């Protein structure tokens with residue numbers, strides 16, 4: 001009973017979270033997952049400020065109201081070579097990664113590692129935070145509040 005959560009740098013408090021190395025989070029699970037990091041789904045304004053500070057990924061993830069990819073450098077295989085906060089318009093499917101926003105993070109680029117899952121609740125799952133540099137933090141708990149996500 002294990003969940004891997006790959007996390008990034010925080011940019012103006014915004015960061016990316018990928019679950020189990022594949023697109024696998026529903027919108028309900030995404031809000032619960034950010035709450036476990038004492039965080040919320042970013043607003044579009046919060047995401048645009050994060051982009052302006054250096055944030056980009058090559059993965060679709062939820063924000064409040066949309067599924068997006070923040071892009072700085074054009075790349076043909078990331079958001080069809082677009083720049084800016086690219087918004088997914090047409091998809092058949094419902095599961096993506098998520099973005100999260102923590103208001104207490106530093107104002108600009110924070111590329112230190114994540115060393116805690118501060119607001120997870122009691123549960124049976126071994127949850128492992130995996131940083132880009134490979135460092136890990138594990139703790140037993142749960143974050144999902146909706147049965148359909150378990």
Ligand SMILES: O=C(CCC1CCCCC1)N1CCOCC1
Nearest residue numbers: 037102105113114115116117118
């Ligand atoms: O776990 C924590 C805080 C513990 C430490 C405290 C300083 C920042 C690095 C790690 N967070 C989860 C998601 O990003 C914002 C905060």
